[PDB]
UniProtKB/Swiss-Prot annotation, chain A:
In many AdoCbl-dependent isomerases, e.g. methylmalonyl-CoA mutase (MCM), its G-protein chaperone is a separate protein. Belongs to the IcmF family. The chain holds residues 458 to 537 of 1093 of the full protein. Signal peptide: none annotated. This is Fused isobutyryl-CoA mutase. Homodimer. It comes from Cupriavidus metallidurans (strain ATCC 43123 / DSM 2839 / NBRC 102507 / CH34). Is composed of four functional domains: the N-terminal 5'-deoxyadenosylcobalamin binding region that is homologous to the small subunit of ICM (IcmB), a middle P-loop GTPase domain (MeaI) that acts as a chaperone for ICM, a structured linker region involved in dimer formation, and a C-terminal part that is homologous to the large substrate-binding subunit of ICM (IcmA). Catalyzes the reversible interconversion of isobutyryl-CoA and n-butyryl-CoA, and to a much lesser extent, of pivalyl-CoA and isovaleryl-CoA, using radical chemistry. Also exhibits GTPase activity, associated with its G-protein domain (MeaI) that functions as a chaperone that assists cofactor delivery and proper holo-enzyme assembly. The G-domain of IcmF also has a role in its cofactor repair. Does not display ATPase activity.
Curated annotation (Swiss-Prot), chain B:
It comes from Cupriavidus metallidurans (strain ATCC 43123 / DSM 2839 / NBRC 102507 / CH34) (Ralstonia metallidurans). This is Fused isobutyryl-CoA mutase. Belongs to the IcmF family. In many AdoCbl-dependent isomerases, e.g. methylmalonyl-CoA mutase (MCM), its G-protein chaperone is a separate protein. Is composed of four functional domains: the N-terminal 5'-deoxyadenosylcobalamin binding region that is homologous to the small subunit of ICM (IcmB), a middle P-loop GTPase domain (MeaI) that acts as a chaperone for ICM, a structured linker region involved in dimer formation, and a C-terminal part that is homologous to the large substrate-binding subunit of ICM (IcmA).
Amino acid sequence: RAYHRRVVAQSKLARERQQLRAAHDMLQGAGHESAALETLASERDVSLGAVERKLLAMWPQMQQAYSGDEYVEI
Amino acid sequence: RAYHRRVVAQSKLARERQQLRAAHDMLQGAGHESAALETLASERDVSLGAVERKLLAMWPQMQQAYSGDEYVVI
């Protein structure tokens, strides 16, 4: 149950981190910029665990692995 | 294929609309605010189709329907 409580907590943080950085790019691409968003986003990076952060980091590389015809020595 | 192209387009807009309004609440709750985010969010409301907008509006009510022991609708 403790594991699942962490799943919810980290998931919420991963979402908020993405939501901020996404919204920041949408502003910066629309001219006016609010660097205050980045401060909150960087706060999420520390909040997100080292294990959880690696999981999201390997995800794009993970998709590239299970995309080809082979799973690449062996 | 045209239908699916719209699915992608509207889905992206629904996400961006949510990402902005979510990030706006996180700033407004952290003191300093940026009403510029709302301008971009309101722009998504016009971009989102009338049919697509209704779909997301009925979703919470849809969950409440399929939650009970009975389907009140006979």
